[PDB]
Every structure is written in C-alpha cells, then in structure tokens.
C-alpha cells in the first residue's frame, strides 16, 4: 500500500541519524545506496542488503576504535603477507598454487601488531571477544596458527596478523562456523610458514538483546530504527 518513494520518506529522520554517526566513507556509501533505493522490490532489497552490512561494519569500526575500510580498499591475504612477511611471500606463492584463491581472501579487518591496519595488542582483542562470548554466550569462533607444537617465547617478538570477520545476519552460528572453515586451510598454511596469525569471527542479528551486540547499544538503536524498519516496510509494501 506504500510506494518505495513513500517508505524512504517516512524513514528520512531515522536514516539521517544513521549517516550522522557513521564514518565518512561509510556514511557516504550508505547515502548513495539509499538514493538508489528511493529511485529503485528486488533492486531495492539488494541495496538495502549492502546498507545493512556496510552500516554495521562502520559501527563495528567505531565500537572497537578501528578504521572503517571500504571493500574497495581492503587488503587481501597475499597483500598482508607481501608487505608484512616479505621474506616468506615468494614461499607464500609456491604453497598456494593448488589453492590460489587463498591469495585474495579479504576479511573485514586484516590487522597486524605495531611493528594493513595496525593494532596495539592482538592478544587484547582476542580476549575481549572471548570475554563477551563467555559472559553473554555470544557465538564466536577463533583459530590461531601454531607451527608444530611450538611454545610462545619471552625473549624475542614476532610480527603477527589479526583476521576479523563480522556480520549482521539472522543465522549467527552458521556464519561463524562458515567463516572458520574458510580460514582453516590458510591458518594451516601459516603454521607451515612459521607465520603467526589469529582468526576471529562473530555475528549479531536483530534478535540479540540490544545490550549484548558487538557494537555499542547506541549504534544498535540507530540500526534497528532504520535498516530494520526499512526491511519490514519493504516486504509489507
């Protein structure tokens, strides 16, 4: 009973509040996609999908004080090895001839420890996810490279990468389980290169209590009163 144009109207104030709190390239993108929705039920759905995730990933960057990287400028695995572990990068090509798809894997966040974005403590991140998971039962999956059964060491430091996977989908467990299965092969590859990498993965959905997401509640309200409402109104009308 409501035409696309009318829906984008009723959801103008809820959406202005969304673009206001996002990072620039995030607000800027989610704004283009909302004008393709106003000028769109399929094509509109397709754009409202990308806003759902791009907006979540900007609030995720905000919550964790990380940097929002638009997909066009996210690094691949081969890019992180090339820059961060150049002495092994050629060997990172040899062992990836039967699985060259590995080279272009592109997570939401490809971090490395302060010698690809840089983070203070890779271990401090993994513990904050493990803490929330344990305290709120929020499904996460984590993996860590480990050549043979090697021990950590206190007399030398090593470069290391952090691979984060986030997502705003209704099947949370399936996403974390499917994310961890995709990085599993490359994690085993890193073990055989002597490269220390950690893979995190998590997901929220709109049924999660607002006080228990991976983004602050203030950003949950912003997401619910907009991207979600627009989706309800998009199926109804």
């Amino acid at each position, epitope marked *: 009973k409501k035409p696309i144009a009318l829906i984008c109207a009723e959801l103008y104030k809820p959406f202005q509040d969304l673009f206001a709190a996002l990072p620039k390239d995030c607000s800027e993108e989610c704004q283009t996609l909302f004008e393709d929705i106003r000028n769109s039920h399929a094509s509109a759905w397709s754009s409202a999908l990308r806003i759902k995730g791009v907006a979540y990933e900007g609030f995720f960057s905000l919550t964790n004080s990380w940097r929002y990287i638009p997909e066009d400028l996210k690094p691949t695995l081969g890019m992180a090895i090339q820059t961060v572990f150049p002495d092994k990068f050629e060997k990172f090509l040899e062992r990836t001839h039967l699985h060259p798809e590995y080279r272009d894997f592109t997570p939401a966040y490809l971090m490395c420890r302060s010698r690809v974005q840089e983070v203070s403590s890779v*271990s401090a991140v993994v*513990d904050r996810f493990k803490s929330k998971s344990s305290e709120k039962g929020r499904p996460i999956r984590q993996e860590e490279s480990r*050549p*043979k*059964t*090697e*021990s*950590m*060491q*206190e*007399d*030398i430091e*090593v470069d290391e990468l952090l691979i984060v996977e986030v997502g705003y989908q209704t099947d949370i467990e399936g996403k974390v389980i499917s994310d961890i299965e995709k990085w599993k092969g490359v994690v085993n590859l890193m073990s055989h290169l*002597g490269i*220390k990498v950690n893979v995190l993965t998590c997901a929220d959905n709109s049924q999660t209590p607002r006080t228990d997401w991976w983004i602050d509640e203030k950003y949950v309200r912003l997401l619910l009163n907009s991207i979600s409402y627009l989706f309800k109104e998009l199926l109804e009308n």
Partner: antibody
Amino acid sequence: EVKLEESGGGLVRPGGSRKLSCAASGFTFSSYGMQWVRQAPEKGLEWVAYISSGSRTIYYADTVKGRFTISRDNPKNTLFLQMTSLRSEDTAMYYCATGYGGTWFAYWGQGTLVTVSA
Amino acid sequence: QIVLSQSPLSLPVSLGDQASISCRSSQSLLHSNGNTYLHWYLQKPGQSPKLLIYKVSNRFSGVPDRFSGSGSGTDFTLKISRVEAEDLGVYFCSQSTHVPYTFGGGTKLEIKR
C-alpha cells in the same frame, strides 16, 4: 637478588589435594612467565606447568592436565599450584622457576616436598 | 613429545681433563622465531638444578667459562674444558621450543680416581 621461596608441601592422601605457593623477590615479578617443575625421588626433572605474565597463556604437562591448576597474584608477587586428585606418582619435590626473560629455567627455588600416600 | 637423548649415561672424568656431553633431539629445536631453545643444567647432589647454558651457547651470568655449548637443529654438545671437583653431579639438557617442555634423562659426571 632473585629469590623464589616455595611453600605448601607435606603429606597428602591419595585422591587428596594441596596448594603450593611460591614467593618471588628481587625482580619485577609481574613481567615474567613462571613455571613449576618436579623431581620424584632418585629420578630426573619433569616439567609441570607454565603461566604467562598476564596469565593469558597456560601450558600443562599431559600427566597433570585436568588435575593441576597454575595461577599467580601479581600485586602479591606469588605463584600458585592447586593440585587435585593426587596419586602416589605425584610424590616429588616441586620447584617454581623463571627465565627472567625466557622460557628456560634460569632461577629455581629450593623446592618443597609433596608426599602422596596413605 | 620432543625426546632428548643424552649420551653417555655416565661420564668418568679425571680432574683437569675435558668432558663432552651430547644431547640429540628427536625433532629440530629451531623455533620459527629464529632461536633454538636448547638449554643445559647442572644439579649438584642435594641441591636444586642450576642453569649453565641457554639457547645452545649463551653462558648464564655467573657461570664459569669452563662450560660451553654448541650445536644446531637436532645435535647439541656441552663441553667442560677443564673439570673441577665441584662439577660433580648430573647434567640435564632441556628444550623449551615446543610444548611440553622436556628434559633429557641426565648424564652423571663422576670424578675419576
């Protein structure tokens, strides 16, 4: 001078429990991984557990897994070993040790003797 | 687990002579960070163990220079250039490259008389 002073040994019935402590002095205890090692009478050295400086990493000998817990209270400069479901083969001298910058056993205590027997 | 094989089991040595103790590793002790975590300890009778050498060849502070270590990969040696009476005891090689950390079974150095 670096010093590690263990306490907590004595007699323990099979299946019983015991908590061993180790007091560190002479170095900034909070920055270094600490370890337990043991030695059964007339035998060799056997590693028991390692705990990182902020307790994030813990390693266990396969023979003590699920029975021994290692921990530390850094503002108190102390290292612990909770031992549970003890067997007669746990009869040993127990030592705390640290590398003071490595995973080797640079500094040792004098050991404390734990006898598990009825 | 990483098994460390010490030979000989016992080593009779006359005062002033050299001694070499040998530690063979069941796998390489080269750690991916570049270091080799193979270490040597002396336990004198009745006392707690003492670190002699760490990371193959670094002599620990306070350790007399008659003690040295060499090797790489899976083959390592401890040398006592000139044996003193005090060196009586059991010598242990240990690895901390891999979990579980492990020891050889010990070489008893006896003084020849």
